[PDB]
Amino acid sequence: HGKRYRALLEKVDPNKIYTIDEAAHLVKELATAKFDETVEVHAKLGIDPRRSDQNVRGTVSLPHGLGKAGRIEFRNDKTGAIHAPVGKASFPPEKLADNIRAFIRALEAHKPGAKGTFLRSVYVTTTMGPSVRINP
Amino acid sequence: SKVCEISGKRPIVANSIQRRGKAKREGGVGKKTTGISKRRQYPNLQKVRVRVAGQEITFRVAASHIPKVYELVERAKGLKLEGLSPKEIKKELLKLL
Amino acid sequence: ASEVRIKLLLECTECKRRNYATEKNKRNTPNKLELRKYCPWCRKHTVHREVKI
Amino acid sequence: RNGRDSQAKRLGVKRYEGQVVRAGNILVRQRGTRFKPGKNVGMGRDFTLFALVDGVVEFQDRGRLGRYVHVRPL
RNA sequence: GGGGGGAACCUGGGGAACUGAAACAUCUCAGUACCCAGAGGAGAGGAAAGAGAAAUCGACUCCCUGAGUAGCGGCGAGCGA
RNA sequence: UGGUGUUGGCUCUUGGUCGCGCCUGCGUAGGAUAGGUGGGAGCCUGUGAACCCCCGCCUCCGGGUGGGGGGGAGGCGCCGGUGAAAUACCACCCUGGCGCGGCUGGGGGCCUAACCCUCGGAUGGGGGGACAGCGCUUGGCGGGCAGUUUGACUGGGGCGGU
RNA sequence: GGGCCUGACUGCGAGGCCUGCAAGCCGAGCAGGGGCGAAAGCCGGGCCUAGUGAACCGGUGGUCCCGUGUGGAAGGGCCAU
RNA sequence: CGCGGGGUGGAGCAGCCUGGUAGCUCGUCGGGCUCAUAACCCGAAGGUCGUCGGUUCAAAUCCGGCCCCCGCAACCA
RNA sequence: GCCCGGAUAGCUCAGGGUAGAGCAGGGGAUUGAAAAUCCCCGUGUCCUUGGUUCGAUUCCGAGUCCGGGCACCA
Ligand SMILES: [Mg+2]
Ligand SMILES: [Mg+2]
Ligand SMILES: [Mg+2]
Ligand SMILES: [Mg+2]
Ligand SMILES: [Mg+2]
Ligand SMILES: [Mg+2]
Ligand SMILES: [Mg+2]
Ligand SMILES: [Mg+2]
Ligand SMILES: [Mg+2]
Ligand SMILES: [Mg+2]
Ligand SMILES: [Mg+2]
Ligand SMILES: [Mg+2]
Ligand SMILES: [Mg+2]
Ligand SMILES: [Mg+2]
Ligand SMILES: [Mg+2]
Ligand SMILES: [Mg+2]
Ligand SMILES: [Mg+2]
Ligand SMILES: [Mg+2]
Ligand SMILES: [Mg+2]
Ligand SMILES: [Mg+2]
Ligand SMILES: [Mg+2]
Ligand SMILES: [Mg+2]
Ligand SMILES: [Mg+2]
Ligand SMILES: [Mg+2]
Ligand SMILES: [Mg+2]
Ligand SMILES: [Mg+2]
Ligand SMILES: [Mg+2]
Ligand SMILES: [Mg+2]
Ligand SMILES: [Mg+2]
Ligand SMILES: [Mg+2]
Ligand SMILES: [Mg+2]
Ligand SMILES: [Mg+2]
Ligand SMILES: [Mg+2]
Ligand SMILES: [Mg+2]
Ligand SMILES: [Mg+2]
Ligand SMILES: [Mg+2]
Ligand SMILES: [Mg+2]
Ligand SMILES: [Mg+2]
Ligand SMILES: [Mg+2]
Ligand SMILES: [Mg+2]
Ligand SMILES: [Mg+2]
Ligand SMILES: [Mg+2]
Ligand SMILES: [Mg+2]
Ligand SMILES: [Mg+2]
Ligand SMILES: [Mg+2]
Ligand SMILES: [Mg+2]
Ligand SMILES: [Mg+2]
Ligand SMILES: [Mg+2]
Ligand SMILES: [Mg+2]
Ligand SMILES: [Mg+2]
Ligand SMILES: [Mg+2]
Ligand SMILES: [Mg+2]
Ligand SMILES: [Mg+2]
Ligand SMILES: [Mg+2]
Ligand SMILES: [Mg+2]
Ligand SMILES: [Mg+2]
Ligand SMILES: [Mg+2]
Ligand SMILES: [Mg+2]
Ligand SMILES: [Mg+2]
Ligand SMILES: [Mg+2]
Ligand SMILES: [Mg+2]
Ligand SMILES: [Mg+2]
Ligand SMILES: [Mg+2]
Ligand SMILES: [Mg+2]
Ligand SMILES: [Zn+2]
Numbered sequence: 091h092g093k094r095y096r097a098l099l100e101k102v103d104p105n106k107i108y109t110i111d112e113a114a115h116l117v118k119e120l121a122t123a124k125f126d127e128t129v130e131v132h133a134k135l136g137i138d139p140r141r142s143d144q145n146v147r148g149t150v151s152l153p154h155g156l157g158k159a160g161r162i163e164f165r166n167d168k169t170g171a172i173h174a175p176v177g178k179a180s181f182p183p184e185k186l187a188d189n190i191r192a193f194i195r196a197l198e199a200h201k202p203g204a205k206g207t208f209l210r211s212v213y214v215t216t217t218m219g220p221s222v223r224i225n226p
Numbered sequence: 227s228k229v230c231e232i233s234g235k236r237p238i239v240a241n242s243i244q245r246r247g248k249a250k251r252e253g254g255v256g257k258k259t260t261g262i263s264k265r266r267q268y269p270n271l272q273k274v275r276v277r278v279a280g281q282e283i284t285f286r287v288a289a290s291h292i293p294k295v296y297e298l299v300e301r302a303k304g305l306k307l308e309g310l311s312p313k314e315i316k317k318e319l320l321k322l323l
Numbered sequence: 324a325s326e327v328r329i330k331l332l333l334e335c336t337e338c339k340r341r342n343y344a345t346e347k348n349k350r351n352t353p354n355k356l357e358l359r360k361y362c363p364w365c366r367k368h369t370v371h372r373e374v375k376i
Numbered sequence: 377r378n379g380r381d382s383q384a385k386r387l388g389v390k391r392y393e394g395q396v397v398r399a400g401n402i403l404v405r406q407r408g409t410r411f412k413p414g415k416n417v418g419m420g421r422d423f424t425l426f427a428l429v430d431g432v433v434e435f436q437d438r439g440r441l442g443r444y445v446h447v448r449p450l
Numbered sequence: 451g452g453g454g455g456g457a458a459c460c461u462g463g464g465g466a467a468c469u470g471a472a473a474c475a476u477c478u479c480a481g482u483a484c485c486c487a488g489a490g491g492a493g494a495g496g497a498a499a500g501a502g503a504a505a506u507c508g509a510c511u512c513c514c515u516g517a518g519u520a521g522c523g524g525c526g527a528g529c530g531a
Numbered sequence: 532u533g534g535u536g537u538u539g540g541c542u543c544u545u546g547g548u549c550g551c552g553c554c555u556g557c558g559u560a561g562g563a564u565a566g567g568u569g570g571g572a573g574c575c576u577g578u579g580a581a582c583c584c585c586c587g588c589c590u591c592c593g594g595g596u597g598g599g600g601g602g603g604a605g606g607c608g609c610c611g612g613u614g615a616a617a618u619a620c621c622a623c624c625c626u627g628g629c630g631c632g633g634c635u636g637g638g639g640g641c642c643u644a645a646c647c648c649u650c651g652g653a654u655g656g657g658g659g660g661a662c663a664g665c666g667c668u669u670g671g672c673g674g675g676c677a678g679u680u681u682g683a684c685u686g687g688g689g690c691g692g693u
Numbered sequence: 694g695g696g697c698c699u700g701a702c703u704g705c706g707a708g709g710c711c712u713g714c715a716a717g718c719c720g721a722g723c724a725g726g727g728g729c730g731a732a733a734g735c736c737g738g739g740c741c742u743a744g745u746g747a748a749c750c751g752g753u754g755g756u757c758c759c760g761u762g763u764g765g766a767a768g769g770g771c772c773a774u
Numbered sequence: 775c776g777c778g779g780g781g782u783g784g785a786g787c788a789g790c791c792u793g794g795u796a797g798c799u800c801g802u803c804g805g806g807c808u809c810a811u812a813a814c815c816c817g818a819a820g821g822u823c824g825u826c827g828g829u830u831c832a833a834a835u836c837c838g839g840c841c842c843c844c845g846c847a848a849c850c851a
Numbered sequence: 852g853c854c855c856g857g858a859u860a861g862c863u864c865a866g867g868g869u870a871g872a873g874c875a876g877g878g879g880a881u882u883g884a885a886a887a888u889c890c891c892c893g894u895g896u897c898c899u900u901g902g903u904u905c906g907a908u909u910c911c912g913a914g915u916c917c918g919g920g921c922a923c924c925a
Binding site for chain 1: 551568570574575578625
Binding site: 382385386387390397398399400401402403405406407408409418420421422423424425426427428429 | 706707708709710711712718719720721722738739740741742743
């Protein structure tokens with residue numbers, strides 16, 4: 091964990107719940123890589139992956155999109171985590187929170203059903219940057 | 227196995243109900259009662275020995291009302307005892323009740 | 324019915340209700356029954372898939 | 377070892393010639409086509425013969441073509 | 451001041467079984483019969499931490515009615531506000 | 532027989548299981564110890580880079596990995612090859628360890644003052660001792676005892692058979 | 694024997710067979726939405742008659758009918774099993 | 775007689791819930807070791823599964839008849 | 852029904868890569884009657900069915916049989 095990544099580790103209080111709005115704020119402040127990073131949105135899904143029935147595939151995106159339309163995918167791994175692009179190293183705020191908001195709405199559209207509150211643990215990060223907690 | 231000298235608690239009779247089966251709540255057929263016989267439920271009588279007016283005095287009391295014994299001793303620290311026999315100190319403490 | 328000839332339900336794949344009960348031999352036919360069947364809630368024919376009775 | 381038997385099944389024809397029958401009246405109870413269905417007679421999944429119209433029952437022997445029960449409307 | 455007695459009636463503490471269920475165990479008989487304590491010319495109960503849908507009634511007790519209703523029930527026999 | 536009440540004063544010793552630290556994950560191919568997806572074209576290094584003393588931790592049987600010293604410009608990754616899958620780096624996690632702290636347990640030891648026993652002597656001495664006894668509650672054994680069930684047909688009933 | 698299929702239908706049922714009860718059997722034809730056929734038509738499983746089990750209690754999926762002052766909920770009803 | 779079990783190379787036993795396959799030990803026979811016999815070692819033969827019938831494409835196997843063997847029962851008089 | 856074992860070669864058994872251990876039975880070295888011992892065999896419905904995998908004896912859904920304990924049976 092070299093010198094750079096700590097600077098960003100000064101910028102994220104570990105004991106805090108952030109907002110769909112707060113995310114778009116801090117994210118353009120953990121992208122201190124030397125390239126226009128992608129913003130990654132993660133979640134720990136509340137289902138069994140071994141269960142053939144309960145499962146997450148599907149396609150979104152909109153509004154803005156991949157920017158590499160902008161249709162993205164999301165499939166859970168064998169562990170129950172989902173995560174996906176997009177979002178980029180600006181991409182202004184209040185223009186990414188909208189993007190980040192609608193991805194959470196899907197998958198929140200695909201509870202197989204399963205057991206509990208779907209979006210158990212949720213997270214938002216950048217490519218070479220720390221994580222932020224956020225609130226679906 | 228008798229009557230609380232403070233509270234009046236005495237043995238009561240109760241049924242002992244033996245049941246088989248799975249509760250409906252748990253998705254069972256229901257509960258069936260495989261025997262009802264009579265039994266007695268007893269106060270948790272114990273002995274509290276206590277020194278009042280330099281005299282050893284024992285109450286046979288239910289555990290629940292044990293604190294009430296040293297309470298009457300607290301109220302009795304104000305009446306003419308000495309030199310009553312233990313039986314009559316007992317009567318006088320009980321009157322404070 | 325038996326261990327191998329089972330009882331089972333047909334569930335309209337569109338509205339997910341069970342409209343038919345029937346049997347099958349799960350050795351001769353180890354795959355969920357998919358048939359077409361009048362669904363009286365949908366009031367049209369629908370593919371029903373096999374569901375555990 | 378023995379001692380068994382099954383219930384009598386009360387077979388046979390239930391309306392003879394000249395009898396007036398309402399429609400779905402049963403005409404013959406049978407196993408197989410001892411009697412074949414004729415004019416105005418249907419045959420159920422168990423070879424039961426029944427009148428398909430109000431009428432008068434009539435029997436016909438057609439040789440190797442079998443015996444036939446008909447209903448003639450009135 | 452108490453003690454002991456009193457036909458039945460009364461309240462409290464205890465509390466069956468035959469029987470019914472055409473067997474029987476839950477259930478029934480029945481909180482009955484009986485034992486015990488206590489009270490009296492009666493006893494109990496009694497001035498809402500009530501009822502329960504009327505924005506309602508108004509301590510208790512007793513009769514009629516509500517009603518064999520609502521319900522309870524090996525949802526059986528029955529039991530029963 | 533577990534919990535708990537009566538039921539108190541000290542004390543040693545352990546084991547589980549949750550939470551953040553950390554590592555850990557190896558068929559054969561492959562540079563070789565590849566956990567799973569997703570981001571990813573850059574990433575570390577003057578806050579000390581490639582190696583190969585010391586340890587600690589592990590290891591599949593090649594090595595991996597953390598802390599410490601040595602040093603004195605470099606390492607990676609992309610590319611590309613084999614690949615079912617690709618290597619940096621980052622994120623969310625899965626498996627199983629490891630310390631630190633929740634919590635919850637079992638195996639002790641002493642003490643005296645409730646309880647218990649006992650001493651021609653008793654507001655006391657001595658002995659047991661928070662056990663035992665006793666209350667509520669849990670499961671177990673339980674013809675010692677209690678209530679009952681233990682079918683019908685039938686060339687009598689039983690046995691047989693139905 | 695082959696092609697295409699799922700009528701091994703849903704909502705009904707004149708009429709009868711059988712019959713102590715209860716059960717058990719057959720059923721033309723009407724509607725919905727289908728299959729096969731050029732069509733007539735046939736199809737509510739199998740050439741037929743064995744391959745089975747009333748209630749009660751409870752499980753599951755529906756339904757959204759009841760919901761102990763009201764809105765919910767608990768729990769129940771109804772349909773399917 | 776009733777109930778239960780059984781009959782398979784020469785002997786004593788598997789196999790048959792379970793249809794398509796007959797196996798173990800000893801014995802027998804041919805060969806070796808030994809001076810010779812046994813023990814031991816190598817190799818082989820021998821069963822149509824009590825018998826008749828049925829079911830089946832196929833019967834040791836499943837079903838029935840008949841024969842025989844074993845165990846149990848036959849009580850209130 | 853709930854939990855824990857079991858079902859992998861001819862016997863008895865070990866275990867996301869896969870099929871190995873001791874014996875059974877075959878070989879070959881020991882130079883030998885024998886055992887013992889070393890190298891070498893390899894026979895595997897991994898109890899079914901479906902599913903996730905590059906790959907399933909292994910993991911997940913549904914089943915079957917056997918043992919221990921518990922519970923339930925209109
Ligand atoms: Mg009880
Ligand atoms: Mg009950
Ligand atoms: Mg005490
Ligand atoms: Mg208490
Ligand atoms: Mg007979
Ligand atoms: Mg008859
Ligand atoms: Mg007959
Ligand atoms: Mg028909
Ligand atoms: Mg004529
Ligand atoms: Mg008594
Ligand atoms: Mg009776
Ligand atoms: Mg009797
Ligand atoms: Mg009784
Ligand atoms: Mg009384
Ligand atoms: Mg009375
Ligand atoms: Mg008196
Ligand atoms: Mg008066
Ligand atoms: Mg009065
Ligand atoms: Mg009074
Ligand atoms: Mg008042
Ligand atoms: Mg009820
Ligand atoms: Mg009943
Ligand atoms: Mg009563
Ligand atoms: Mg106890
Ligand atoms: Mg306590
Ligand atoms: Mg305490
Ligand atoms: Mg001690
Ligand atoms: Mg104790
Ligand atoms: Mg007990
Ligand atoms: Mg007993
Ligand atoms: Mg007895
Ligand atoms: Mg009785
Ligand atoms: Mg008795
Ligand atoms: Mg009985
Ligand atoms: Mg008789
Ligand atoms: Mg006779
Ligand atoms: Mg006679
Ligand atoms: Mg006889
Ligand atoms: Mg008999
Ligand atoms: Mg249809
Ligand atoms: Mg009719
Ligand atoms: Mg009738
Ligand atoms: Mg028709
Ligand atoms: Mg039509
Ligand atoms: Mg048509
Ligand atoms: Mg056509
Ligand atoms: Mg047509
Ligand atoms: Mg045919
Ligand atoms: Mg019910
Ligand atoms: Mg409902
Ligand atoms: Mg309400
Ligand atoms: Mg309403
Ligand atoms: Mg219906
Ligand atoms: Mg023989
Ligand atoms: Mg076999
Ligand atoms: Mg010889
Ligand atoms: Mg010689
Ligand atoms: Mg024979
Ligand atoms: Mg044949
Ligand atoms: Mg034959
Ligand atoms: Mg054969
Ligand atoms: Mg033969
Ligand atoms: Mg006798
Ligand atoms: Mg005799
Ligand atoms: Zn439908």
